[PDB]
Symmetry: C4
Subunit: 165 residues, 4 copies
Amino acid sequence: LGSMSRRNPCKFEIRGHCLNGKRCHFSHNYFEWPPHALLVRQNFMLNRILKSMDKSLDRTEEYALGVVGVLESYIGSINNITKQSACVAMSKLLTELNSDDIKKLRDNEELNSPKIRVYNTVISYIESNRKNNKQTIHLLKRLPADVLKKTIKNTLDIHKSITIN
Amino acid sequence: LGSMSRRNPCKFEIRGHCLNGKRCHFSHNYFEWPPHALLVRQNFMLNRILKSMDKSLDRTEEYALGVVGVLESYIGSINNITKQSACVAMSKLLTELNSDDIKKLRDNEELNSPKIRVYNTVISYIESNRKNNKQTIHLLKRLPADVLKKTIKNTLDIHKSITIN
Amino acid sequence: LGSMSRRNPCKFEIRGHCLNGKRCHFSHNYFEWPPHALLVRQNFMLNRILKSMDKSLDRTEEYALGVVGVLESYIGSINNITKQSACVAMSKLLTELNSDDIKKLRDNEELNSPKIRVYNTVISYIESNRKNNKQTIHLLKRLPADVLKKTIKNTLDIHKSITIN
Amino acid sequence: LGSMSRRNPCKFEIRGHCLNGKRCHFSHNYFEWPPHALLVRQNFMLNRILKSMDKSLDRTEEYALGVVGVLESYIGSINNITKQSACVAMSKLLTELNSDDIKKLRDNEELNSPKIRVYNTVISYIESNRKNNKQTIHLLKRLPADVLKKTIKNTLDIHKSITIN
């Protein structure tokens, strides 16, 4: 008939690599895992590969707000958000976006629509931020509050927009 | 019975990383996502990892044509495509192909078939372009129009061919 | 009707790349593979990409214990584990964890809970270990046994905890 | 009712990135793809990421034999395989294996089994080859034919063995 039983996938392994040696009784053999476990492991591992190739507001309130909450809070001068913090979070936001999405938007516009100007500006900041975020940050720090908060607002709008169409 | 409800996966997270902190009510826990969402996220994340390890015609018309449309347009002297532009797009095309596919084609040929010569040329350009695209581009810029447009045409033919067999 | 038969996926390819040339009769065409095989291959390949971007207790007993067994054994002065070995294994453990998980834990705490202090310490070690494990290791080697074994114990507790909630 | 129809995924995109701009009528939206297509794309993309992070017998006969056929052919002095070629192919074979698999084998052995010696040798070559294949190759070229062919044979045996258990 077979064995009564099969071994379940190891939860440590689903998150990366099990560090428990032979002491461990769960399965570490991908050929016997159900698909869901293998799909979950792939997402943990992709996060790890991506983090380990990255180049270089950790407190409780900032974490709960996230980069978006911090940026929204700076624009409304609430929650005690400095301009320094808002400029780091902005780099983080720009790293999360990608130009190719701005470009699909950009080409849905009537010619010399004013929105084409804002797109190309955000696109420009993504590229710069990709090259060197530390440079890019400084650059945001020199912008006057009013214009900074407007660029930010533009970026957040596009961020949301891309994700809900 | 359980709860009446389960949380849906977060669309921001499906595209990368949700930047909305604790403010966000959607699921960010891969163990509770349905498979489709996890498969979609993997493709967004692979695109990101691949882009962030790359080394270095953005206008509306070029974007709509794509690298292939630009290359086809240069060969027919339409759409206002410079030789410079056609040589960049060609590098982009060569980055998208891979030698191993030319080689499976190459070994379907009668010995000293003339097609073996063209394959080994494209293969040669992929390798060069991999090493340094900027060098490779210059090299394409010095080729005479007639021969350039023929090499291009060869590359596009193989590109299409690999994808429809 | 079709052919009586389809080719099965190649087990070498499921693990990476088949090195058997045309001599091989199994399928190497991902369009004809069943989903399970493609999910298994992705996990082998992600392990390979991750290993090939990493920067730099191999014996039988250590391997069976794993990094966790080694660390648990040092704390109880059994199994013949040196302080050197325990500090390498600790780096390996810290590479396997990620800060973002400590931070989700950290924000479940009453303000000035003593546990917040320990979290921020582990978080601090992950970041350091990420920067340079060799530096980080030395740093662990200078800590006095009693405190080392306590930091270790904290790390293992969090490791287990993250994985079973 | 909905539309009569849905767009099929783009075969170019399944293999990487479609370079056909807006001219293209197939779907490039991963949210509407069926799972199989998304699983196939992930394997093409993982191959690309892996190739683009690699560091540095292309002829018809060699390609058909593959690295394994070349190595088997050298050992039997057939097919016109030089010692140089056999040493490159050997590096390629060593890149495809991974130590962690030799180690699971190694710990299935009675103590001071002679097989433990051979494992640790192969393991040693993988690590060296990982560090610098060009160095590692030279090193294989200096080994005397008889011993080379024996090391090779050991490596192939383990390669096959790992894959069929």
